[PDB]
Design an enzyme around this catalytic site. Sequence first.
Site, PDB file in Angstrom:
ATOM      1  N   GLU A 107      35.603  45.713  35.288  1.00  6.18           N
ATOM      2  CA  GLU A 107      35.231  45.086  34.049  1.00  6.18           C
ATOM      3  C   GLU A 107      36.416  44.521  33.294  1.00  6.18           C
ATOM      4  OE1 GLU A 107      32.780  48.616  32.952  1.00  6.18           O
ATOM      5  OE2 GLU A 107      31.012  47.241  33.144  1.00  6.18           O
ATOM      6  N   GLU A 110      28.010  49.404  41.547  1.00  3.60           N
ATOM      7  CA  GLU A 110      27.317  50.387  40.731  1.00  3.60           C
ATOM      8  C   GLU A 110      25.864  50.063  40.756  1.00  3.60           C
ATOM      9  OE1 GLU A 110      30.688  49.663  37.569  1.00  3.60           O
ATOM     10  OE2 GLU A 110      29.165  50.951  36.603  1.00  3.60           O
TER      11      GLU A 110
HETATM   12  C1  LIG Z   1      29.636  50.344  35.362  1.00  5.01           C
HETATM   13  C2  LIG Z   1      31.007  50.804  34.902  1.00  5.01           C
HETATM   14  C3  LIG Z   1      31.055  52.286  34.610  1.00  5.01           C
HETATM   15  O1  LIG Z   1      32.390  52.578  34.208  1.00  5.01           O
HETATM   16  C4  LIG Z   1      30.064  52.659  33.473  1.00  5.01           C
HETATM   17  O2  LIG Z   1      30.384  51.968  32.243  1.00  5.01           O
HETATM   18  C5  LIG Z   1      28.694  52.183  34.027  1.00  5.01           C
HETATM   19  C6  LIG Z   1      27.652  52.376  32.940  1.00  5.01           C
HETATM   20  O3  LIG Z   1      27.685  53.762  32.486  1.00  5.01           O
HETATM   21  O4  LIG Z   1      28.688  50.768  34.364  1.00  5.01           O
HETATM   22 MG   LIG Z   2      33.638  49.507  31.234  1.00  4.39          MG
END
Ligand SMILES: *[C@@H]1C[C@@H](O)[C@@H](O)[C@@H](CO)O1
Ligand SMILES: [Mg+2]
Lengths: 193, 204, 1011
Positions: free
Chosen positions: B51, B127
Amino acid sequence: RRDWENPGVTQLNRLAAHPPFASWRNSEEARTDRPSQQLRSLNGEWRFAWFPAPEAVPESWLECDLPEADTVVVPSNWQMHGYDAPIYTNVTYPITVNPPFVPTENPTGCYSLTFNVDESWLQEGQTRIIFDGVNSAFHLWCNGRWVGYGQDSRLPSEFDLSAFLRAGENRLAVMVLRWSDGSYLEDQDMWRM
Amino acid sequence: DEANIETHGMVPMNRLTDDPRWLPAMSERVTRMVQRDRNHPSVIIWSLGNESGHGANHDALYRWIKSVDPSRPVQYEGGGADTTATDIICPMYARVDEDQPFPAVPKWSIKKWLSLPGETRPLILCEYAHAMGNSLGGFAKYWQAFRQYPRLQGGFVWDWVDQSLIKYDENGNPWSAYGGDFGDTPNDRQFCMNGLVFADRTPH
Amino acid sequence: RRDWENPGVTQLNRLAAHPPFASWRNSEEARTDRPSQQLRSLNGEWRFAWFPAPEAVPESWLECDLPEADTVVVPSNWQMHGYDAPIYTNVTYPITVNPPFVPTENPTGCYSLTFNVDESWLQEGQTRIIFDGVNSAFHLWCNGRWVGYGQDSRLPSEFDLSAFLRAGENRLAVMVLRWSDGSYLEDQDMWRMSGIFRDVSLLHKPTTQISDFHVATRFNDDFSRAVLEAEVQMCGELRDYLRVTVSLWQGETQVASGTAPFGGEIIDERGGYADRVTLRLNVENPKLWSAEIPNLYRAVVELHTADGTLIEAEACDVGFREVRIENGLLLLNGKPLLIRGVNRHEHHPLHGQVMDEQTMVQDILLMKQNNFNAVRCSHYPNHPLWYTLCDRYGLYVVDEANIETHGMVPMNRLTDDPRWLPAMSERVTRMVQRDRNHPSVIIWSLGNESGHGANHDALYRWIKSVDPSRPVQYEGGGADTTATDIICPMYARVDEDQPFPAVPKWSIKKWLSLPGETRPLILCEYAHAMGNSLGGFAKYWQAFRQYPRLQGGFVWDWVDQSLIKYDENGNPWSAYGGDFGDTPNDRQFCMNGLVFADRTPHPALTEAKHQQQFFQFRLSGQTIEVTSEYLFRHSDNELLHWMVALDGKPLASGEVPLDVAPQGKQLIELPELPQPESAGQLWLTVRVVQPNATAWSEAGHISAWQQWRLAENLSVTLPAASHAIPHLTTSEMDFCIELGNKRWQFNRQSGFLSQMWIGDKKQLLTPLRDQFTRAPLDNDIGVSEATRIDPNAWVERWKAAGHYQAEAALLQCTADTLADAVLITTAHAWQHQGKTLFISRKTYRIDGSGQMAITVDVEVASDTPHPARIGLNCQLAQVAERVNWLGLGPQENYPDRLTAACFDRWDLPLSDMYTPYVFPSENGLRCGTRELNYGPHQWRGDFQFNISRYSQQQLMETSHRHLLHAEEGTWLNIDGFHMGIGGDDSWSPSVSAEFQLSAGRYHYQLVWCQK
Ligand SMILES: *[C@@H]1C[C@@H](O)[C@@H](O)[C@@H](CO)O1
Ligand SMILES: [Mg+2]
Ligand SMILES: *[C@@H]1C[C@@H](O)[C@@H](O)[C@@H](CO)O1
Ligand SMILES: [Mg+2]
Ligand SMILES: [Mg+2]
Ligand SMILES: [Mg+2]
Ligand SMILES: [Mg+2]
Ligand SMILES: [Mg+2]
Ligand SMILES: [Mg+2]
Ligand SMILES: [Mg+2]
Ligand code: NA
Ligand code: NA
Ligand code: NA
Ligand code: NA
Ligand code: NA
Ligand code: NA
């Protein structure tokens, strides 16, 4: 220099990264992955004191134990010992967004350890210290003299202590910053410790 | 094995990763990882982080890896999960059949994603199946799709264990705490508990 | 902190890089590129003191001027002021290789300036200082307080002094380190100097300002429509009332204009850039930019409020052009380029590495006048004005990051190391950030001679990712690595392979077709022009034209890097490596240019001009076919001139206007060619003349030429019975011949013509003897050192074989009388260590007409190295003012370097027959000569010759032209055959087989007579 507010300085005097070493001096041991007398652990009881900002750390601490320090186990996260609160925030940074700056009130953990080094280690060769994980940035001193600095809370930071130690007792001092420009690259969705 | 780089809170998310002044710091987080972990057979894929949008620093780093270690593919989900910085389509939360056409970074149905015009990469969710609380509804729909489509090569459930912490009451009895329970604010409350197992490893 | 021994600290407090700014506060001034009141130059008189190391700098210096300091001009290189010596080393680093450390003894230049600052600059806005060039690293203080630090000697370093200045007098202090970890990335083959060598300025920007802007131009399929896209970023407080207007101007006409508030489109889950905006302007039928017609528009970017109040304006010249690689060809506006390029260093013989506009302009004009259309910034970003001039005059430019680590072992030791990725990245990223809006920049280069490391691959992709508009090239690691879009070797030969391990240099023709290869090939360096060189230049050109994927190259290089030194009497002379006490050094290897330091051309330049002509010609009967190699322009400033001469004597000529479309052809029929009245060879010469002056040339400029032999009428006309018959006088030691008031003397023990008299005047100082050697050229020498002989170099082969030591042994000397002449016959052997190297057999026939006919037949042992020449030489007693000949010229020409010369009758002052190469050697030859005139003497035959006041012996014994001295009389060397000069490279034998004198037996004949 406030190296912790400069993404141009992620380290000072740190050694190159490399695969796991143990410097065995017996090959059969290396074959079987047995403990190496050349790779010693410094984990256990250390001295620690918490300060609200790096500016509040006393110069005495570089050369001498602070009497107010407590004895705690290392490795550890200082929040787990109750010195300050751990924070759980997902996306929003736990600090104001104003790169590469961090707050002036920046929780600082002052760790130190008095430990022995046998002369045999000093007569020949190189003695390095390895910190497998320090969150989020830190300065290191050995016997009161500054050795180096490091960032990236999830990789090992290694420094050559060869010219800084002496046979017998030695004292390390590690000033650890909670926030740094490295924090801008550590926004994972997890507790901030 | 994934570099310690996430700048999710920036606006836009790639503000730092597209900035060359941040290339050096990001670079150390990717090169130092490869240098340390490249002899482990268990590592099969390198990830450029998580991210942090898609910035040119990603593309440079993706190439550096490709160069130093041709033995393992490189993936990265930022900026739409299928950018030029990933060898694998690796979305997070893309649904089986339903599209979520968000602007700029849509989350296409996984079945549909594979066949978009010109696409040929494998797809493995970085994920999926957010296991927060009473969840995992629709889990079987993923598995049925992974088995029927060769190029749907699975995924990484989000996630293993709840990030709950132990606190003690007035009586000294322990209790599971989450965001805000330490006086922390702002906080995201229970959002830190998304695992298949409780913090002590008891299964949900 | 010793920040100058840590590659992890390349700067402190330095501001982001960006394109050229001026912060105009009036849009029309921005439009017209006029001087901005917000951009001040701090160039001029500064204070300076030199120290041996930073540790010796007094702390007092920060607060006030050192009394011991001197007043000097800035910009400058302190070596040019005499403070320390500049060093010329090619590959070996000038400091011990022990990265990232530098010597403790580190020359430090302490510069300071006291200057004024107006309160209006301080009461609001931001005042920054900009150092366009500081070699190699520096710390900056202002009013005693520390500001910041910077590295990379070839890009500007800027710092905000807003909080450090005060209205009135202020003092800057800059401590410049000669050496730093940056030097490990600055190992270019050039003089090693230091100092504040490019401009220093103050720029005032408003707090709410344009902080960056990028301009792109995309087109439709036939280039008849374009989209100008301008991305603009700001710094300061965003407010809804803010706006950006980008307007496009073609001269005084406003072509397009668009306005928008800040706020870009959504980029990802977190949104978009609230501090940026992109304006898109449609342009119909844009006038396209090229080196042929550098059409430019002006883009003005205004930051203002909704009510119309201007905050500031920035601007740039815009060239509409697309560069792309397609199907293996480099295209510009969809047409495949043919790069007539040259590498050019920023070098001035008096100012060192300080550039000024007049020098730049002079270079550009000479370049254009000489048919070059491209330049490679070897090997660092150039002074900013350079790009402005290329954009406007029109030259294709390769912009190159300041990264060269040639001295490492192996070459990629640092570039493959990730700890050096950050420093290297700044050298690439900051160049792109600065120069990306210039249309003249068509290709980015990752640097030079740094091997091939993973850092190059990472930076190659960074570029491709931020600027897809221009290809990326890089030569290191073998010239065809994954870090290059173009195969761009240095000194790969045309036909000959050089299969070095790991990094072979294949024949360019073969390289293109190696299995799987598909990219275009443009040499980043070729035709090393060191000294008497450029031998085989035509061979490159012929291949480039024949092979579509062979798209040209950059000759190495433009200008000799010689520096001026002064002798006892104060007279200037040209110096090279070692001449400043610098050691180690690479001597003359810094002089590889097509022009001397002062811009006077070397003879090679004319060869370059001719082979790089833009018009090709063919002749068929009375028909001349002209073909244009221009891709975009019609020949609208050209006329074809033609002339037919018989042995030099004009018979007819005329002119025809040229009207050929780009890539087209034009047929021109010559008029009936009236027979000629005399034996001889008719020659047709054509020239393309530009009647009108242009921005780069004067009216009358000749841009191309070609010649052809037409009919020849051989002479069958029997002479005429001499008026008298020469007499032979035989004595024990001599054979003398007398005819009228002329006398010839042949010594019977030596077997040579030892003296010739006109009346009682002796004409020789040295006898007429064969000569098989030449004063070695730089190309003959190679790297051979007296201290480290390279046995494979030509000069070493010749030495070792005894060519320079061989002595003539007489085998025979006889005299006979014929009905109307006297005949002398001789034979000599040249031996060395008991082996016969050469045998020379001759006849001298002196007749009633007074002409002496010399016939020479030579044998050359097959196992001896092929000789430098096969000729005769002598020192004439007289000195005459002019040299007149019927042969190739007018300038110096050699077998492998004579295409540009023309066959005609030339006449020059004797000194023009000598080429003053800084490192002297054989020079001034003219080939294809049928008649030579000097004083009352005339020589006729088909030979090559050189004539000057310097013997070959002197030239070979002298290292610098300033030390040569005219000998008595005139040395004449007349060659039946002369070896080529080569130059594909200057460190290995490079003369092509077809130009080596390997035939074994040679024949030539000359007539010497009086005029
Ligand atoms: C994908 C990234 C992980 O770190 C969390 O933020 C998850 C949501 O709980 O999304
Ligand atoms: Mg994040
Ligand atoms: C190519 C690189 C350039 O800097 C010079 O060293 C040239 C030889 O003079 O080769
Ligand atoms: Mg830092
Ligand atoms: Mg043991
Ligand atoms: Mg002790
Ligand atoms: Mg909340
Ligand atoms: Mg440094
Ligand atoms: Mg070099
Ligand atoms: Mg010709
Ligand atoms: Na599958
Ligand atoms: Na979560
Ligand atoms: Na070609
Ligand atoms: Na050179
Ligand atoms: Na014309
Ligand atoms: Na010489």
